[PDB]
Amino acid sequence: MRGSHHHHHHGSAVSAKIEIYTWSTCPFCMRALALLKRKGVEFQEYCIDGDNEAREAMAARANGKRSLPQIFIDDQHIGGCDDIYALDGAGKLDPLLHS
């Protein structure tokens, strides 16, 4: 296992689980995506263009909300575009990512 390895009882390597539900052409979704992209983190986008079933799945997790986008970090609902930009403005988003 040649290389420079960090040890601190990590066990199986796992990282932050970051999810965002979008319509590809929604300007608020686009703005949220840009922020996540600028952070350089790895994330999963659920592009649900025209998919009503997926929207209902989203609503079930997002406090019944059907507005877009909806963002989750480590299974916690963070909210929408304004919520994530607000967090960043307060210096609270990097810790969630989690740095």
PDB file of N, CA, C and O in Angstrom, residues 34-86:
ATOM      1  N   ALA A  34     -23.925  26.221  -9.313  1.00  0.00           N
ATOM      2  CA  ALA A  34     -22.686  26.978  -9.485  1.00  0.00           C
ATOM      3  C   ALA A  34     -21.911  27.084  -8.178  1.00  0.00           C
ATOM      4  O   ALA A  34     -20.691  26.940  -8.165  1.00  0.00           O
ATOM      5  N   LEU A  35     -22.618  27.338  -7.082  1.00  0.00           N
ATOM      6  CA  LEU A  35     -21.979  27.421  -5.768  1.00  0.00           C
ATOM      7  C   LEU A  35     -21.307  26.107  -5.368  1.00  0.00           C
ATOM      8  O   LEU A  35     -20.147  26.104  -4.945  1.00  0.00           O
ATOM      9  N   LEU A  36     -22.032  24.996  -5.483  1.00  0.00           N
ATOM     10  CA  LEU A  36     -21.459  23.688  -5.178  1.00  0.00           C
ATOM     11  C   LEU A  36     -20.262  23.405  -6.081  1.00  0.00           C
ATOM     12  O   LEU A  36     -19.247  22.871  -5.637  1.00  0.00           O
ATOM     13  N   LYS A  37     -20.376  23.755  -7.356  1.00  0.00           N
ATOM     14  CA  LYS A  37     -19.267  23.530  -8.266  1.00  0.00           C
ATOM     15  C   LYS A  37     -18.052  24.371  -7.870  1.00  0.00           C
ATOM     16  O   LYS A  37     -16.918  23.882  -7.885  1.00  0.00           O
ATOM     17  N   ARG A  38     -18.281  25.625  -7.495  1.00  0.00           N
ATOM     18  CA  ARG A  38     -17.164  26.485  -7.097  1.00  0.00           C
ATOM     19  C   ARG A  38     -16.451  25.966  -5.836  1.00  0.00           C
ATOM     20  O   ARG A  38     -15.246  26.167  -5.670  1.00  0.00           O
ATOM     21  N   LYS A  39     -17.189  25.300  -4.956  1.00  0.00           N
ATOM     22  CA  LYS A  39     -16.588  24.717  -3.758  1.00  0.00           C
ATOM     23  C   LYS A  39     -15.689  23.535  -4.110  1.00  0.00           C
ATOM     24  O   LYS A  39     -14.791  23.182  -3.351  1.00  0.00           O
ATOM     25  N   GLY A  40     -15.941  22.918  -5.259  1.00  0.00           N
ATOM     26  CA  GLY A  40     -15.123  21.809  -5.721  1.00  0.00           C
ATOM     27  C   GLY A  40     -15.442  20.477  -5.062  1.00  0.00           C
ATOM     28  O   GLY A  40     -14.697  19.509  -5.225  1.00  0.00           O
ATOM     29  N   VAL A  41     -16.537  20.422  -4.310  1.00  0.00           N
ATOM     30  CA  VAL A  41     -16.936  19.182  -3.640  1.00  0.00           C
ATOM     31  C   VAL A  41     -17.585  18.186  -4.603  1.00  0.00           C
ATOM     32  O   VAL A  41     -18.052  18.555  -5.677  1.00  0.00           O
ATOM     33  N   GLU A  42     -17.583  16.913  -4.222  1.00  0.00           N
ATOM     34  CA  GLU A  42     -18.233  15.875  -5.003  1.00  0.00           C
ATOM     35  C   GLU A  42     -19.696  15.829  -4.586  1.00  0.00           C
ATOM     36  O   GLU A  42     -19.994  15.793  -3.398  1.00  0.00           O
ATOM     37  N   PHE A  43     -20.615  15.846  -5.546  1.00  0.00           N
ATOM     38  CA  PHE A  43     -22.026  15.816  -5.182  1.00  0.00           C
ATOM     39  C   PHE A  43     -22.889  15.126  -6.226  1.00  0.00           C
ATOM     40  O   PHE A  43     -22.465  14.916  -7.362  1.00  0.00           O
ATOM     41  N   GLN A  44     -24.098  14.752  -5.825  1.00  0.00           N
ATOM     42  CA  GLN A  44     -25.025  14.081  -6.722  1.00  0.00           C
ATOM     43  C   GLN A  44     -26.182  15.024  -7.052  1.00  0.00           C
ATOM     44  O   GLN A  44     -26.800  15.603  -6.154  1.00  0.00           O
ATOM     45  N   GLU A  45     -26.464  15.184  -8.337  1.00  0.00           N
ATOM     46  CA  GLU A  45     -27.590  16.008  -8.773  1.00  0.00           C
ATOM     47  C   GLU A  45     -28.727  15.096  -9.231  1.00  0.00           C
ATOM     48  O   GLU A  45     -28.525  14.233 -10.082  1.00  0.00           O
ATOM     49  N   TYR A  46     -29.911  15.270  -8.655  1.00  0.00           N
ATOM     50  CA  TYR A  46     -31.090  14.570  -9.154  1.00  0.00           C
ATOM     51  C   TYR A  46     -31.850  15.500 -10.083  1.00  0.00           C
ATOM     52  O   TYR A  46     -32.671  16.301  -9.636  1.00  0.00           O
ATOM     53  N   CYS A  47     -31.546  15.413 -11.372  1.00  0.00           N
ATOM     54  CA  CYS A  47     -32.233  16.237 -12.347  1.00  0.00           C
ATOM     55  C   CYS A  47     -33.590  15.617 -12.679  1.00  0.00           C
ATOM     56  O   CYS A  47     -33.677  14.574 -13.330  1.00  0.00           O
ATOM     57  N   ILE A  48     -34.649  16.262 -12.207  1.00  0.00           N
ATOM     58  CA  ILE A  48     -35.982  15.673 -12.306  1.00  0.00           C
ATOM     59  C   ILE A  48     -36.910  16.371 -13.299  1.00  0.00           C
ATOM     60  O   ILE A  48     -38.134  16.328 -13.154  1.00  0.00           O
ATOM     61  N   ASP A  49     -36.318  16.980 -14.325  1.00  0.00           N
ATOM     62  CA  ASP A  49     -37.074  17.589 -15.411  1.00  0.00           C
ATOM     63  C   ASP A  49     -38.275  16.715 -15.775  1.00  0.00           C
ATOM     64  O   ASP A  49     -38.116  15.547 -16.126  1.00  0.00           O
ATOM     65  N   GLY A  50     -39.468  17.286 -15.680  1.00  0.00           N
ATOM     66  CA  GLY A  50     -40.675  16.630 -16.154  1.00  0.00           C
ATOM     67  C   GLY A  50     -41.099  15.370 -15.412  1.00  0.00           C
ATOM     68  O   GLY A  50     -42.086  14.737 -15.785  1.00  0.00           O
ATOM     69  N   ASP A  51     -40.368  15.014 -14.360  1.00  0.00           N
ATOM     70  CA  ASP A  51     -40.621  13.776 -13.618  1.00  0.00           C
ATOM     71  C   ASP A  51     -41.457  14.041 -12.366  1.00  0.00           C
ATOM     72  O   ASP A  51     -40.927  14.444 -11.334  1.00  0.00           O
ATOM     73  N   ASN A  52     -42.770  13.836 -12.435  1.00  0.00           N
ATOM     74  CA  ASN A  52     -43.592  14.111 -11.256  1.00  0.00           C
ATOM     75  C   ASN A  52     -43.386  13.125 -10.105  1.00  0.00           C
ATOM     76  O   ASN A  52     -43.489  13.504  -8.940  1.00  0.00           O
ATOM     77  N   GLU A  53     -43.102  11.868 -10.425  1.00  0.00           N
ATOM     78  CA  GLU A  53     -42.871  10.889  -9.367  1.00  0.00           C
ATOM     79  C   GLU A  53     -41.666  11.281  -8.525  1.00  0.00           C
ATOM     80  O   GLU A  53     -41.693  11.196  -7.300  1.00  0.00           O
ATOM     81  N   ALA A  54     -40.600  11.713  -9.188  1.00  0.00           N
ATOM     82  CA  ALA A  54     -39.389  12.099  -8.482  1.00  0.00           C
ATOM     83  C   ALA A  54     -39.639  13.333  -7.617  1.00  0.00           C
ATOM     84  O   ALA A  54     -39.022  13.503  -6.560  1.00  0.00           O
ATOM     85  N   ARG A  55     -40.539  14.200  -8.064  1.00  0.00           N
ATOM     86  CA  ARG A  55     -40.831  15.419  -7.313  1.00  0.00           C
ATOM     87  C   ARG A  55     -41.561  15.059  -6.032  1.00  0.00           C
ATOM     88  O   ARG A  55     -41.384  15.696  -5.004  1.00  0.00           O
ATOM     89  N   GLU A  56     -42.394  14.030  -6.101  1.00  0.00           N
ATOM     90  CA  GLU A  56     -43.125  13.603  -4.916  1.00  0.00           C
ATOM     91  C   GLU A  56     -42.193  12.930  -3.928  1.00  0.00           C
ATOM     92  O   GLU A  56     -42.370  13.060  -2.719  1.00  0.00           O
ATOM     93  N   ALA A  57     -41.181  12.235  -4.439  1.00  0.00           N
ATOM     94  CA  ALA A  57     -40.164  11.636  -3.580  1.00  0.00           C
ATOM     95  C   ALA A  57     -39.398  12.753  -2.892  1.00  0.00           C
ATOM     96  O   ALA A  57     -39.103  12.683  -1.699  1.00  0.00           O
ATOM     97  N   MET A  58     -39.081  13.796  -3.655  1.00  0.00           N
ATOM     98  CA  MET A  58     -38.380  14.939  -3.094  1.00  0.00           C
ATOM     99  C   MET A  58     -39.196  15.591  -1.980  1.00  0.00           C
ATOM    100  O   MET A  58     -38.682  15.840  -0.889  1.00  0.00           O
ATOM    101  N   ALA A  59     -40.463  15.872  -2.270  1.00  0.00           N
ATOM    102  CA  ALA A  59     -41.362  16.507  -1.312  1.00  0.00           C
ATOM    103  C   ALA A  59     -41.447  15.744   0.010  1.00  0.00           C
ATOM    104  O   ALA A  59     -41.523  16.344   1.082  1.00  0.00           O
ATOM    105  N   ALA A  60     -41.443  14.419  -0.077  1.00  0.00           N
ATOM    106  CA  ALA A  60     -41.497  13.567   1.111  1.00  0.00           C
ATOM    107  C   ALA A  60     -40.329  13.809   2.069  1.00  0.00           C
ATOM    108  O   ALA A  60     -40.480  13.664   3.286  1.00  0.00           O
ATOM    109  N   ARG A  61     -39.166  14.153   1.516  1.00  0.00           N
ATOM    110  CA  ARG A  61     -37.981  14.456   2.318  1.00  0.00           C
ATOM    111  C   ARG A  61     -37.855  15.937   2.668  1.00  0.00           C
ATOM    112  O   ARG A  61     -37.223  16.289   3.663  1.00  0.00           O
ATOM    113  N   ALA A  62     -38.406  16.805   1.823  1.00  0.00           N
ATOM    114  CA  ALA A  62     -38.141  18.239   1.933  1.00  0.00           C
ATOM    115  C   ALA A  62     -39.250  18.993   2.668  1.00  0.00           C
ATOM    116  O   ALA A  62     -39.575  20.135   2.309  1.00  0.00           O
ATOM    117  N   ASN A  63     -39.830  18.363   3.687  1.00  0.00           N
ATOM    118  CA  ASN A  63     -40.897  18.992   4.462  1.00  0.00           C
ATOM    119  C   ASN A  63     -42.141  19.281   3.633  1.00  0.00           C
ATOM    120  O   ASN A  63     -42.828  20.278   3.880  1.00  0.00           O
ATOM    121  N   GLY A  64     -42.420  18.421   2.655  1.00  0.00           N
ATOM    122  CA  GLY A  64     -43.549  18.612   1.760  1.00  0.00           C
ATOM    123  C   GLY A  64     -43.340  19.649   0.668  1.00  0.00           C
ATOM    124  O   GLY A  64     -44.226  19.858  -0.164  1.00  0.00           O
ATOM    125  N   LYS A  65     -42.185  20.308   0.659  1.00  0.00           N
ATOM    126  CA  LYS A  65     -41.948  21.376  -0.318  1.00  0.00           C
ATOM    127  C   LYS A  65     -41.668  20.826  -1.704  1.00  0.00           C
ATOM    128  O   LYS A  65     -40.921  19.853  -1.857  1.00  0.00           O
ATOM    129  N   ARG A  66     -42.257  21.463  -2.712  1.00  0.00           N
ATOM    130  CA  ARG A  66     -42.045  21.062  -4.098  1.00  0.00           C
ATOM    131  C   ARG A  66     -41.266  22.105  -4.882  1.00  0.00           C
ATOM    132  O   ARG A  66     -41.060  21.940  -6.072  1.00  0.00           O
ATOM    133  N   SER A  67     -40.858  23.185  -4.218  1.00  0.00           N
ATOM    134  CA  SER A  67     -40.039  24.214  -4.855  1.00  0.00           C
ATOM    135  C   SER A  67     -38.642  23.665  -5.123  1.00  0.00           C
ATOM    136  O   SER A  67     -38.207  22.730  -4.466  1.00  0.00           O
ATOM    137  N   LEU A  68     -37.947  24.261  -6.086  1.00  0.00           N
ATOM    138  CA  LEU A  68     -36.616  23.809  -6.479  1.00  0.00           C
ATOM    139  C   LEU A  68     -35.597  24.943  -6.354  1.00  0.00           C
ATOM    140  O   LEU A  68     -35.945  26.104  -6.513  1.00  0.00           O
ATOM    141  N   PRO A  69     -34.330  24.607  -6.065  1.00  0.00           N
ATOM    142  CA  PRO A  69     -33.843  23.251  -5.796  1.00  0.00           C
ATOM    143  C   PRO A  69     -34.089  22.866  -4.340  1.00  0.00           C
ATOM    144  O   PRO A  69     -34.507  23.703  -3.536  1.00  0.00           O
ATOM    145  N   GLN A  70     -33.858  21.602  -4.008  1.00  0.00           N
ATOM    146  CA  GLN A  70     -33.787  21.196  -2.614  1.00  0.00           C
ATOM    147  C   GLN A  70     -32.438  20.522  -2.393  1.00  0.00           C
ATOM    148  O   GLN A  70     -32.033  19.661  -3.171  1.00  0.00           O
ATOM    149  N   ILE A  71     -31.763  20.909  -1.316  1.00  0.00           N
ATOM    150  CA  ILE A  71     -30.427  20.422  -1.020  1.00  0.00           C
ATOM    151  C   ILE A  71     -30.375  19.666   0.298  1.00  0.00           C
ATOM    152  O   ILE A  71     -30.932  20.114   1.298  1.00  0.00           O
ATOM    153  N   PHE A  72     -29.694  18.520   0.290  1.00  0.00           N
ATOM    154  CA  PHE A  72     -29.451  17.757   1.516  1.00  0.00           C
ATOM    155  C   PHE A  72     -27.954  17.513   1.688  1.00  0.00           C
ATOM    156  O   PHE A  72     -27.250  17.229   0.714  1.00  0.00           O
ATOM    157  N   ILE A  73     -27.475  17.624   2.921  1.00  0.00           N
ATOM    158  CA  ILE A  73     -26.091  17.288   3.237  1.00  0.00           C
ATOM    159  C   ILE A  73     -26.076  16.318   4.418  1.00  0.00           C
ATOM    160  O   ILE A  73     -26.577  16.638   5.503  1.00  0.00           O
ATOM    161  N   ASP A  74     -25.497  15.143   4.194  1.00  0.00           N
ATOM    162  CA  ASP A  74     -25.505  14.052   5.166  1.00  0.00           C
ATOM    163  C   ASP A  74     -26.916  13.724   5.658  1.00  0.00           C
ATOM    164  O   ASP A  74     -27.139  13.482   6.847  1.00  0.00           O
ATOM    165  N   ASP A  75     -27.858  13.715   4.719  1.00  0.00           N
ATOM    166  CA  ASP A  75     -29.245  13.333   4.977  1.00  0.00           C
ATOM    167  C   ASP A  75     -30.051  14.411   5.682  1.00  0.00           C
ATOM    168  O   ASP A  75     -31.249  14.232   5.938  1.00  0.00           O
ATOM    169  N   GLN A  76     -29.408  15.532   5.997  1.00  0.00           N
ATOM    170  CA  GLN A  76     -30.138  16.664   6.564  1.00  0.00           C
ATOM    171  C   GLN A  76     -30.626  17.618   5.487  1.00  0.00           C
ATOM    172  O   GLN A  76     -29.863  18.032   4.615  1.00  0.00           O
ATOM    173  N   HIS A  77     -31.900  17.982   5.555  1.00  0.00           N
ATOM    174  CA  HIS A  77     -32.440  18.959   4.621  1.00  0.00           C
ATOM    175  C   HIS A  77     -31.860  20.342   4.915  1.00  0.00           C
ATOM    176  O   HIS A  77     -32.052  20.888   6.005  1.00  0.00           O
ATOM    177  N   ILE A  78     -31.163  20.924   3.940  1.00  0.00           N
ATOM    178  CA  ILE A  78     -30.569  22.242   4.128  1.00  0.00           C
ATOM    179  C   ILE A  78     -31.499  23.337   3.615  1.00  0.00           C
ATOM    180  O   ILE A  78     -31.529  24.441   4.156  1.00  0.00           O
ATOM    181  N   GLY A  79     -32.253  23.019   2.568  1.00  0.00           N
ATOM    182  CA  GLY A  79     -33.207  23.945   1.997  1.00  0.00           C
ATOM    183  C   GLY A  79     -32.904  24.221   0.539  1.00  0.00           C
ATOM    184  O   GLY A  79     -32.453  23.339  -0.190  1.00  0.00           O
ATOM    185  N   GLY A  80     -33.140  25.460   0.117  1.00  0.00           N
ATOM    186  CA  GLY A  80     -33.013  25.829  -1.277  1.00  0.00           C
ATOM    187  C   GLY A  80     -31.807  26.694  -1.588  1.00  0.00           C
ATOM    188  O   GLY A  80     -30.848  26.763  -0.816  1.00  0.00           O
ATOM    189  N   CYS A  81     -31.859  27.355  -2.739  1.00  0.00           N
ATOM    190  CA  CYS A  81     -30.753  28.177  -3.207  1.00  0.00           C
ATOM    191  C   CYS A  81     -30.454  29.299  -2.213  1.00  0.00           C
ATOM    192  O   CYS A  81     -29.316  29.483  -1.789  1.00  0.00           O
ATOM    193  N   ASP A  82     -31.486  30.034  -1.819  1.00  0.00           N
ATOM    194  CA  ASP A  82     -31.305  31.110  -0.852  1.00  0.00           C
ATOM    195  C   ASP A  82     -30.727  30.606   0.476  1.00  0.00           C
ATOM    196  O   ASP A  82     -29.908  31.282   1.100  1.00  0.00           O
ATOM    197  N   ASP A  83     -31.149  29.421   0.908  1.00  0.00           N
ATOM    198  CA  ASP A  83     -30.653  28.869   2.171  1.00  0.00           C
ATOM    199  C   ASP A  83     -29.162  28.571   2.102  1.00  0.00           C
ATOM    200  O   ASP A  83     -28.421  28.865   3.036  1.00  0.00           O
ATOM    201  N   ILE A  84     -28.713  27.975   0.999  1.00  0.00           N
ATOM    202  CA  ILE A  84     -27.297  27.638   0.879  1.00  0.00           C
ATOM    203  C   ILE A  84     -26.408  28.872   0.697  1.00  0.00           C
ATOM    204  O   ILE A  84     -25.307  28.946   1.250  1.00  0.00           O
ATOM    205  N   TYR A  85     -26.877  29.849  -0.065  1.00  0.00           N
ATOM    206  CA  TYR A  85     -26.139  31.104  -0.165  1.00  0.00           C
ATOM    207  C   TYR A  85     -26.095  31.845   1.180  1.00  0.00           C
ATOM    208  O   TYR A  85     -25.065  32.418   1.545  1.00  0.00           O
ATOM    209  N   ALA A  86     -27.202  31.824   1.921  1.00  0.00           N
ATOM    210  CA  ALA A  86     -27.236  32.435   3.252  1.00  0.00           C
ATOM    211  C   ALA A  86     -26.230  31.770   4.193  1.00  0.00           C
ATOM    212  O   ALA A  86     -25.489  32.447   4.910  1.00  0.00           O
TER     213      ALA A  86
END
